[PDB]
From a paper:
Mer is a transmembrane tyrosine receptor kinase with extracellular immunoglobulin and fibronectin-like domains that recognize ligands such as growth arrest specific 6 (Gas6) and protein S. Ligand-binding leads to autophosphorylation of activation loop tyrosine (Tyr749, Tyr753 and Tyr754), recruitment of adaptor proteins (Grb2, LimD4, and Vav1), and activation of downstream enzymes (PI3K, MAPK, and GTPase). Mer behaves as a proto-oncogene, having roles in cellular transformation of NIH/3T3 and B-lymphocytes cells. To characterize the active site and regulatory mechanisms of Mer and advance rational approaches toward the development of chemical probes, crystal structures of its kinase domain with nucleotide ligands ADP and ANP and the inhibitor compound-52 (C52) were determined.
The ADP and ANP nucleotide structures superimposed very well with an RMSD of 0.11 Å. The DFG-Asp741 is poised in a catalytically competent state; its carboxyl group is involved in hydrogen bonds with (1) a chelated magnesium ion and its coordinated water molecules, (2) the amino group of the catalytic lysine (Lys619), and (3) the amide group of the catalytic Asn728. The magnesium ion is coordinated to the α- and β-phosphoryl oxygens, two axial water molecules, the Asn728 side-chain, and the DFG-Asp741 carboxyl group, consistent with a typical protein kinase catalytically competent state. The side-chain of Leu744 is buried in the interlobe pocket, above DFG-Phe742 and between the αC helix and the β4- and β5-strands; it is also protected from the solvent by the side-chain of the αC-Glu637.
Author numbering: 575 to 595, 597 to 621, 625 to 658, 666 to 745, 762 to 861
Write the structure that this text describes.
Amino acid sequence: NKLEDVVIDRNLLILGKILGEEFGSVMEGNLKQEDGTSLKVAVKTMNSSQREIEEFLSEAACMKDFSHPNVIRLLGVCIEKPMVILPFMKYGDLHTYLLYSRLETGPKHIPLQTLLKFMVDIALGMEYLSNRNFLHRDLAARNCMLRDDMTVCVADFGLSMPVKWIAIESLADRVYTSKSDVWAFGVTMWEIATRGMTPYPGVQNHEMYDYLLHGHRLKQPEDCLDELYEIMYSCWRTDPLDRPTFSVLRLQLEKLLESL
Ligand SMILES: Nc1ncnc2c1ncn2[C@@H]1O[C@H](COP(=O)(O)OP(=O)(O)O)[C@@H](O)[C@H]1O
Ligand SMILES: [Cl-]
Ligand SMILES: [Cl-]
Ligand SMILES: [Mg+2]
């Protein structure tokens, strides 16, 4: 009953072109605001029990209350069939951006100081979520969005295959904790320092557990500072408990950036 303040009236929403397509489609849209003005949004669609539907609205109400510059907001949900409504980020996801920087007509070559700042943004957003015991469960550069001022925010968390982002302990069992998000953040850092390489070249998805079980990890990128590799490497320690917290990671990266 009380969790209806997360619901948006359908006729305040206009749906346009598809941005992306398995168990959902994401579309551009316009949302009319209490302001009277209209905002550009991205809309992701997704039993029929009353117990299961309240569990969704609660989670959504939770996410709508998140307010941090490095965490994307949930604007609300429309129910026709549920659709979650997020602000549209014109500059798109960090992974594509990273690939474009390696091509003419894309952003310029991204210097080290900018790549590190991206990692600090993501660490902060992750620290914010972790502080609220909210597991992300799908961190990767493709899920880090660029705001119009070029700050990075984490996205596509909560509300419920990317094998190469999944921590060893989570491959082995049905186990996902904050330390698994930390593993994923290391992979995301590696994606950023490689300017968008797919993790583990030469390793196939189905080989990933055997490969990790043998103690192999993502290799240091060619010209990336030893200090930076040490930080990402600590994210993949076999024992989840030996991995640093996000608060620890975030300060390590700030101090590294500050040193340059
Ligand atoms: N809030 C948003 N604003 C703008 N584009 C978005 C937003 N959320 C997702 N997208 C884009 O829509 C497409 C589909 O997103 P998604 O289904 O989350 O796929 P992916 O697996 O690439 O992250 C992607 O290209 C993604 O970058
Ligand atoms: Cl590549
Ligand atoms: Cl590798
Ligand atoms: Mg996504």
